[PDB]
Amino acid sequence: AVDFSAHPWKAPGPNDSRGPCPGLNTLANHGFLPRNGRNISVPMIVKAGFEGYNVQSDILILAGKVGMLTSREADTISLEDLKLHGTIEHDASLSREDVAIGDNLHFNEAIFTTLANSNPGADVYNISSAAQVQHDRLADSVARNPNVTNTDLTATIRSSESAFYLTVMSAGDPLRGEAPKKFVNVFFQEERMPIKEGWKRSTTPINLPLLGPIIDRITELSDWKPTGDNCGAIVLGPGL
């Protein structure tokens, strides 16, 4: 079918567009998406997500078209466009800072420490660990960011993203909702598929039916509460 030896990892160059998403960045770093990270359409994301991760079109079409809002182009984005705050990009990221008090675009090792330290005693991250991380990340934003946005919508996106790293970077069936720390850490830290370390694309399709109960369970265990107005309104386009 598809050859991963034909999709080598290469570090992004100075003019390669990268965004706040390790999922799409990794695909770009492997040429599943254009290495320059530009002129990326939803069909390209669908194909790239399938080929790279076995993530199905249901979630990628839905998230894809929302992400398209971040650009000024008709049907494409640069990966960096996705940093636009309040479309998808949200406070209390796993590996980026809140835009009001820092860089919401680039990987940040200090931020990532909370996740990297989660689930002490196991060699995997799992649903309970992901939930604790989300709780701790949100508490941090509430403590240090007086403009924190925390809504039903941001909470759901956050849980989705956790479900993604648990499933896409899994060793076993993605259903189990657990992934080796060695895989997940390479994914975030280097935005690389950890092939060397033993990772293989899931042979189980990762789609909304599979992700949905993982997402809800992460949310449930995270002891989440809304902030302020709880308005789930998205930013519809740049420079508004």
DSSP-derived letter for residue 93 is: -
Q: Which residue stretches of 68-145 are H helix?
A: 109-116, 127-144
Report the chain's terminal Cα–Cα distance, integer Å. 44
| 59 neighbors 211 (Cβ within 8 angstroms) | yes
User: Which residue in the set 66, 195, 221, 235 belongs to the binding site for ligand A1H13 (CB under 6 A)?
Assistant: 66
Q: Write each residue from 164 to 203 as x if it is in contact with its own copies (CB under 8 A), else as -, in one continuous string.
A: ----------------------------------------
228 lines the binding site for its own copies (CB under 8 A): no
Q: Are 212 and 220 in contact (CB under 8 A)?
A: no
At residue 52, the 3 state secondary structure works out as helix
Rule CB under 6 A: choose which of 9, 12, 34, 39 binds ligand NAG. 39
Of residues 171 through 200, those in contact with ligand NAG by CB under 6 A are none
Asked if 146 is part of the footprint of ligand NAG (rule: CB under 6 A), the reply reads yes
- 239 is a site residue for ligand NAG (CB under 6 A): no
Applying CB under 5 A, the site for Mg ion has a residue count of 4
CB of 130 to ligand NAG, least distance (A): 9
Beta strand pairing status for 124-126 and 178-180?
Answer: antiparallel
- Helix 57-67 to helix 42-53 angle (10° resolution) is 140
Contact code string over 115-134 relative to ligand NAG, x by CB under 6 A: ----x-xx---xxxx-----
Does 64 interact with ligand HEM (rule: CB under 6 A)? yes
Instruction: Look at residue 96 and give the partner it binds from ligand A1H13, ligand NAG, Mg ion, none, a contact being a CB closer than 5 to 8 Å depending on partner kind.
Output: Mg ion
Q: Distance of alpha carbon 131 from its chain centroid, rounded?
A: 15
85: DSSP letter: B
CB 23 within 8 A of CB 160: no
Residue among 60, 63, 99, 138 that touches ligand A1H13 (CB under 6 A): 63
Interacting residues with ligand NAG (CB under 6 A) = 39, 100, 119, 121-122, 126-129, 146-147
